[PDB]
Enzyme design. Structure first.
Site, PDB file in Angstrom:
ATOM      1  N   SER A  42       0.790  -1.220   0.000  1.00 49.55           N
ATOM      2  CA  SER A  42       0.000   0.000   0.000  1.00 49.55           C
ATOM      3  C   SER A  42       0.823   1.271   0.000  1.00 49.55           C
ATOM      4  CB  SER A  42      -0.917   0.026   1.245  1.00 49.55           C
ATOM      5  OG  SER A  42      -1.986  -0.904   1.195  1.00 49.55           O
ATOM      6  N   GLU A 140      -5.624  -3.239  -6.481  1.00 50.94           N
ATOM      7  CA  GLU A 140      -6.006  -4.024  -5.310  1.00 50.94           C
ATOM      8  C   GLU A 140      -7.060  -5.060  -5.703  1.00 50.94           C
ATOM      9  OE1 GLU A 140      -4.467  -3.777  -2.653  1.00 50.94           O
ATOM     10  OE2 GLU A 140      -3.775  -1.694  -2.417  1.00 50.94           O
ATOM     11  N   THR A 209       2.203   3.312   5.279  1.00 55.24           N
ATOM     12  CA  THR A 209       2.573   1.915   5.485  1.00 55.24           C
ATOM     13  C   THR A 209       2.156   1.064   4.291  1.00 55.24           C
ATOM     14  OG1 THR A 209       0.449   1.644   6.576  1.00 55.24           O
ATOM     15  CG2 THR A 209       2.359   2.068   7.986  1.00 55.24           C
ATOM     16  N   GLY A 210       2.667  -0.147   4.273  1.00 55.80           N
ATOM     17  CA  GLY A 210       2.147  -1.170   3.368  1.00 55.80           C
ATOM     18  C   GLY A 210       2.304  -2.513   4.025  1.00 55.80           C
ATOM     19  N   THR A 211       1.357  -3.410   3.759  1.00 55.14           N
ATOM     20  CA  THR A 211       1.366  -4.738   4.342  1.00 55.14           C
ATOM     21  C   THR A 211       0.813  -5.665   3.272  1.00 55.14           C
ATOM     22  OG1 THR A 211       0.904  -3.737   6.481  1.00 55.14           O
ATOM     23  CG2 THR A 211       0.635  -6.090   6.314  1.00 55.14           C
TER      24      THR A 211
HETATM   25  C1  LIG Z   1      -1.767  -2.102   1.833  1.00 54.21           C
HETATM   26  O1  LIG Z   1      -0.653  -2.493   2.068  1.00 54.21           O
HETATM   27  C2  LIG Z   1      -2.936  -2.967   2.397  1.00 54.21           C
HETATM   28  C3  LIG Z   1      -3.516  -2.266   3.683  1.00 54.21           C
HETATM   29  N1  LIG Z   1      -2.431  -1.350   4.132  1.00 54.21           N
HETATM   30  C4  LIG Z   1      -1.972  -1.621   5.341  1.00 54.21           C
HETATM   31  C5  LIG Z   1      -1.012  -0.928   5.871  1.00 54.21           C
HETATM   32  O2  LIG Z   1      -0.433  -1.232   6.858  1.00 54.21           O
HETATM   33  O3  LIG Z   1      -0.862   0.146   5.346  1.00 54.21           O
HETATM   34  C6  LIG Z   1      -2.572  -2.760   5.853  1.00 54.21           C
HETATM   35  S1  LIG Z   1      -2.312  -3.618   7.411  1.00 54.21           S
HETATM   36  C7  LIG Z   1      -3.656  -2.876   8.473  1.00 54.21           C
HETATM   37  C8  LIG Z   1      -3.281  -1.554   9.090  1.00 54.21           C
HETATM   38  N2  LIG Z   1      -2.341  -1.904  10.172  1.00 54.21           N
HETATM   39  C9  LIG Z   1      -2.774  -3.205  10.741  1.00 54.21           C
HETATM   40  C10 LIG Z   1      -1.549  -4.165  10.785  1.00 54.21           C
HETATM   41  O4  LIG Z   1      -0.465  -3.801  10.450  1.00 54.21           O
HETATM   42  N3  LIG Z   1      -1.768  -5.374  11.283  1.00 54.21           N
HETATM   43  C11 LIG Z   1      -0.893  -6.387  11.391  1.00 54.21           C
HETATM   44  C12 LIG Z   1       0.460  -6.252  11.485  1.00 54.21           C
HETATM   45  C13 LIG Z   1       1.297  -7.322  11.576  1.00 54.21           C
HETATM   46  C14 LIG Z   1       0.817  -8.573  11.591  1.00 54.21           C
HETATM   47  C15 LIG Z   1      -0.526  -8.756  11.538  1.00 54.21           C
HETATM   48  C16 LIG Z   1      -1.027 -10.188  11.555  1.00 54.21           C
HETATM   49  O5  LIG Z   1      -0.225 -11.114  11.448  1.00 54.21           O
HETATM   50  O6  LIG Z   1      -2.242 -10.318  11.653  1.00 54.21           O
HETATM   51  C17 LIG Z   1      -1.383  -7.661  11.433  1.00 54.21           C
HETATM   52  C18 LIG Z   1      -3.809  -3.736   9.750  1.00 54.21           C
HETATM   53  C19 LIG Z   1      -3.679  -3.231   4.886  1.00 54.21           C
HETATM   54  C20 LIG Z   1      -3.460  -4.723   4.587  1.00 54.21           C
HETATM   55  C21 LIG Z   1      -4.051  -3.422   1.400  1.00 54.21           C
HETATM   56  C22 LIG Z   1      -4.861  -2.239   0.829  1.00 54.21           C
HETATM   57  O7  LIG Z   1      -3.459  -4.142   0.354  1.00 54.21           O
END
Ligand SMILES: *C(=O)[C@@H]([C@@H]1NC(C(=O)O)=C(S[C@@H]2CN[C@H](C(=O)Nc3cccc(C(=O)O)c3)C2)[C@@H]1C)[C@@H](C)O
Ligand SMILES: C[C@@H](O)[C@@H](C=O)[C@@H]1NC(C(=O)O)=C(S[C@@H]2CN[C@H](C(=O)Nc3cccc(C(=O)O)c3)C2)[C@@H]1C
Length: 265
Positions: A42, A140, A209-211
Site C-alpha cells: 500500500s 487491489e 505503510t504497506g502490508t
Molecule cells: C496495503 O498495504 C494494504 C492495507 N495497508 C496496510 C497498511 O499497513 O498500510 C494494511 S495492514 C492494516 C493496518 N495496520 C494493521 C496491521 O499492520 N496489522 C498487522 C500487522 C502485523 C501482523 C498482523 C497479523 O499477522 O495479523 C497484522 C492492519 C492493509 C493490509 C491493502 C490495501 O493491500
C-alpha cells in the site's frame, strides 16, 4: 555496526529487510539491501495521491465519485461505508493514505485513467520524477500477491525514498498540493508501530505503510528532528520463508527504525 545490526534483525524475524535514508548535509546515505526490489503493497498510495493532485486543479478534490458493491474487493475501512453516497476525490485521497483504503486506491487509479486501469499512468508519474525502477502492474487486491522475487508491483527502498523526498521536501508538487499530501501522511492512522515507534517523541513523523502477503511489511516516512532537519526513511520487509501466509512483523520495522534514529540523533 549498522549492517551487522540489520543482518541480526533479518535472522531474528526470518526476514529480508531493506532500508534507505538519503544523504543530507552532514549524514551519509544509510543503505541496506536498498537496491533490491520489494513489493510496494500500500505504499504506492502516497505517490498515487500525488499523481492525482498533480494532474488536476485543486478543486477536483470536490468531485463526487460513485461506485458499487462489486468495487469493494480489498480492505477498505472507509469506502465500505459509502457505496450509496459515493466519496469525493478528497475523501478518497484521505482514506487511501490515512486508512490505507484499497477501494479508494482503485478509484483513484481509475481517476488517473489510461491503460491498466491507471497503473500505467501511475508508473508514468514515477518516471516523471526520475524513478526508472518502480513499476505498478495490478490494482487491489492483486498487487500484494506477487511471489517473492517477482518484479511486478515492486519498488526499492532507494527508489521510493527518492520519490518521497521529491514529493514532500522537493518541488514535485506546488506548495498547496504538497501541503495536502503532507497533512494526510501526518494524520496517518496505520503507522504507530513502524517508523514512528523507532523515533523519539520530539521528532515529527509522517508516513505511509504497506502490508501484504509473504509477510510483507513496509513503511515510508519523512521525519523531522526537534530543530526542523528532515530525513526520508524507507523500510521494507518480507518473509518468504513463511510462505504466502507468513505474518507481517511490524516489530522488525520498529527495531530497524530505532537503529536509524540512533544514527540520525
Ligand atoms: C496495503 O498495504 C494494504 C492495507 N495497508 C496496510 C497498511 O499497513 O498500510 C494494511 S495492514 C492494516 C493496518 N495496520 C494493521 C496491521 O499492520 N496489522 C498487522 C500487522 C502485523 C501482523 C498482523 C497479523 O499477522 O495479523 C497484522 C492492519 C492493509 C493490509 C491493502 C490495501 O493491500
Ligand atoms: S490479535 C490481532 C490479529 N492479527 C494481529 C497479529 O496477529 N499481529 C501480530 C502477530 C505477530 C507479530 C506481530 C508483529 O507486529 O511483529 C503482529 C493482532
Amino acid at each position: 555496526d549498522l549492517a551487522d545490526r540489520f543482518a541480526e534483525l533479518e535472522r531474528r524475524y526470518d526476514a529480508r529487510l531493506g532500508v534507505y535514508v538519503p544523504a543530507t548535509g552532514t549524514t551519509a546515505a544509510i543503505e541496506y539491501r536498498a537496491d533490491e526490489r520489494f513489493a510496494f503493497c500500500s505504499t504506492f498510495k502516497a505517490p498515487l495521491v500525488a499523481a492525482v493532485l498533480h494532474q488536476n486543479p485543486l478543486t477536483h478534490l470536490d468531485k463526487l465519485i460513485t461506485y458499487t458493491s462489486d468495487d469493494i474487493r480489498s480492505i477498505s475501512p472507509v469506502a465500505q461505508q459509502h457505496v450509496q453516497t459515493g466519496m469525493t476525490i478528497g475523501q478518497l485521497c484521505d482514506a487511501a493514505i490515512r486508512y490505507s483504503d484499497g477501494t479508494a486506491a482503485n478509484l483513484l487509479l481509475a481517476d488517473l485513467g489510461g491503460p491498466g486501469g491507471g497503473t500505467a499512468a501511475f508508473t508514468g508519474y514515477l518516471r516523471s520524477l526520475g524513478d526508472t525502477v518502480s513499476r505498478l502492474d495490478a490494482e487491489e487486491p492483486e498487487l500484494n500477491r506477487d511471489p517473492p522475487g517477482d518484479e511486478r508491483d515492486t519498488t526499492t527502498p532507494h527508489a521510493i525514498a527518492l520519490v518521497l523526498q521529491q514529493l514532500v521536501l522537493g518541488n514535485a508538487l506546488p506548495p498547496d498540493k504538497r501541503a495536502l499530501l503532507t497533512d494526510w501522511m501526518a494524520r496517518n492512522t496505520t503507522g504507530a508501530k513502524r517508523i514512528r515507534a523507532g523515533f523519539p517523541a520530539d521528532w515529527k513523523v509522517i508516513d505511509k505503510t504497506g502490508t501484504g502477503d509473504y509477510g510483507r511489511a513496509n513503511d515510508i516516512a519523512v521525519v523531522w528532528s526537534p530543530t526542523g532537519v528532515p530525513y526520508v526513511v524507507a523500510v521494507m520487509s518480507d518473509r518468504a520463508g513463511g510462505g504466502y501466509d507468513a505474518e507481517p512483523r511490524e516489530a522488525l520495522l520498529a527495531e530497524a527504525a530505532t537503529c536509524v534514529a540512533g544514527v540520525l540523533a
